[PDB]
Design a binder for this molecule. Sequence first.
Ligand SMILES: Nc1nc2c(ncn2[C@@H]2O[C@H](COP(=O)(O)OP(=O)(O)NP(=O)(O)O)[C@@H](O)[C@H]2O)c(=O)[nH]1
Ligand SMILES: Nc1nc2c(ncn2[C@@H]2O[C@H](COP(=O)(O)OP(=O)(O)NP(=O)(O)O)[C@@H](O)[C@H]2O)c(=O)[nH]1
Ligand SMILES: Nc1nc2c(ncn2[C@@H]2O[C@H](COP(=O)(O)OP(=O)(O)NP(=O)(O)O)[C@@H](O)[C@H]2O)c(=O)[nH]1
Lengths: 297, 314
Amino acid sequence: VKLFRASEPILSVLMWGVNHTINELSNVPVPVMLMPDDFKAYSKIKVDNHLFNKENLPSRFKFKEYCPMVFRNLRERFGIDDQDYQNSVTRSAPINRFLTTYDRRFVIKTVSSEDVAEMHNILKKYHQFIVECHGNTLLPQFLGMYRLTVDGVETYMVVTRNVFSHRLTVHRKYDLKVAREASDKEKAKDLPTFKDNDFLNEGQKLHVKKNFLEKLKRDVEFLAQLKIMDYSLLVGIHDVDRAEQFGPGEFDPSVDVYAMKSHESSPKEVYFMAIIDILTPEQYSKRFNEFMSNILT
Amino acid sequence: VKLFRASEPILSVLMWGVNHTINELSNVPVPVMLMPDDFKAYSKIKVDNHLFNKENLPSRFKFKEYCPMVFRNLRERFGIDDQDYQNSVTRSAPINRFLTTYDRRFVIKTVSSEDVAEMHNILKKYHQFIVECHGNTLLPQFLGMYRLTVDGVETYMVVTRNVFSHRLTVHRKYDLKGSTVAREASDKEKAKDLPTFKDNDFLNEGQKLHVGEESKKNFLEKLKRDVEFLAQLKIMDYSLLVGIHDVDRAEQEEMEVEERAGPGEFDPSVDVYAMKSHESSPKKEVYFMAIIDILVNPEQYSKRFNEFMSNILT
Ligand SMILES: Nc1nc2c(ncn2[C@@H]2O[C@H](COP(=O)(O)OP(=O)(O)NP(=O)(O)O)[C@@H](O)[C@H]2O)c(=O)[nH]1
Ligand SMILES: Nc1nc2c(ncn2[C@@H]2O[C@H](COP(=O)(O)OP(=O)(O)NP(=O)(O)O)[C@@H](O)[C@H]2O)c(=O)[nH]1
Ligand SMILES: Nc1nc2c(ncn2[C@@H]2O[C@H](COP(=O)(O)OP(=O)(O)NP(=O)(O)O)[C@@H](O)[C@H]2O)c(=O)[nH]1
């Protein structure tokens, strides 16, 4: 029994919504191919519940799913089963807009109307690229896109596969791309988002490189051709020994897709690296490219 | 994998709605008791799809379920499981508004806004009656009440358990009121396959139903409390629907079926209104007898009704 028990009405509606659209989809046949209209398509449902089942859900709310055929195909191509996705969102309220499913597999980010517009703008080529690279990429894996109406307020969400391990604690993270670096207050946060300079003058490398670089180049090239910028490479680091204070450094490469073991010859950790934030050319790409090509040793 | 394929979009939407509402209710816990708000409550869903899932469902439709907590409970008290209900409605399209589920277990009747209003008016009392009578009644067993919206047009529907068997074939039928006013069937109706014979038609044939005392007493006691309950509310024009199954004829028809390619028994948990003919009647038969259409004065209407049905059978 999924009650859609959550800290805020909006989370409840998200849970309800994912549950609903995925059951509905299970009634929709898997087609031989995506079609042009699938990229211009949506489902919309409006709920108006008088004196009923408003123990957790708002009595009145809307839920809209952009291009459900496309995002179900992306799901399949990312090796993700519809039932597991549904369970991750619904079996328990997602946790604290930036959200994570209770099991930490999927990230739910609140986004703008123009982010949604832009996603629609890249979606065909992005899909074709996921096809052509066989879901082997560092780009965000987009799993679903929704608009929620709650108390008259529209909210937009995008679901991605988590960059980080859904199990291995991340001990230090960097957001790589002038010059930028972490603030005098952000550096006082539990897990700080460090930047390029904090990384450079700290003299850190990542002993691992072939796959990562081939992949990364192909990706940032694709992002260039779409005239997109501002995207960052998210890097996460889990210190095995630090955890050691069901084995340490143990993970499922088919789940934690971006995870990477430290090379046998190293001062032992787990790295997670993936490109985030591309919903916004050449120079940015080659600059980004070279900066990241110099972290792997 | 339910496609909701149907010859009319109204039916697809019916299937989708029962499916959707039953699954939703599966998330809703079963209460210790029903509350007053449960009798004034409704669920409403409005769907506007664009360029998506249009092979069977229309892109735009509305579905409303009346007092769903109540009807769920009613289903429980009539020994009908929600998954079975759902399956009966959605596994395959209902068939010919007067519909029957593909498996013949449930009747879907198209009604009026007036009808829906009267359901609400009588619902708390009908519920309590079903409670204190333990589900043992000739009255319609109400299982669900819905409003569909297709093409800006609104359609109300009431679901009941079939009075007739979901398996056994009905070879003759009567709609009986007991009116002093003459009630026969038209040449039109009499030319139909299974005509709806009426009062004077029943009188004319010297027709009688022999069920034996122990079944007669049960029947008549049900009937007496039923029409007394109906008389209490301002309820009139309701009928006794009478189906007659010829066991022998059926064995014959089956035989013609197996040739061109058990006997007179039934599950009373399922064919709730079925009665075997008396161990020593002429031809052996099964009858189905229920009160239908409950949505001069009511008291006398029920005296006039009860005397006629009381004489309908020995
Ligand atoms: N655990 C986890 N955290 C993430 C993931 N993606 C982003 N984050 C974190 O959430 C924040 C959101 O970053 P971003 O997508 O750039 O959103 P933004 O608001 O446009 N940028 P900013 O970080 O400056 O606010 C980042 O600081 C990052 O640390 C993820 O997949 N998993
Ligand atoms: N006694 C009673 N009648 C009710 C109740 N709910 C609905 N009705 C009656 O049932 C009839 C059908 O109502 P319905 O078609 O749902 O629509 P509506 O409530 O009129 N408004 P709308 O058509 O805008 O949805 C109406 O005549 C209404 O008065 C209730 O709780 N109690
Ligand atoms: N198989 C079956 N037929 C039923 C059932 N209830 C009613 N009918 C039939 O369906 C028709 C309509 O019955 P009724 O409820 O009186 O509807 P109505 O609209 O009030 N009357 P009518 O349609 O005859 O003018 C009749 O042919 C009746 O015999 C039922 O449970 N099962």
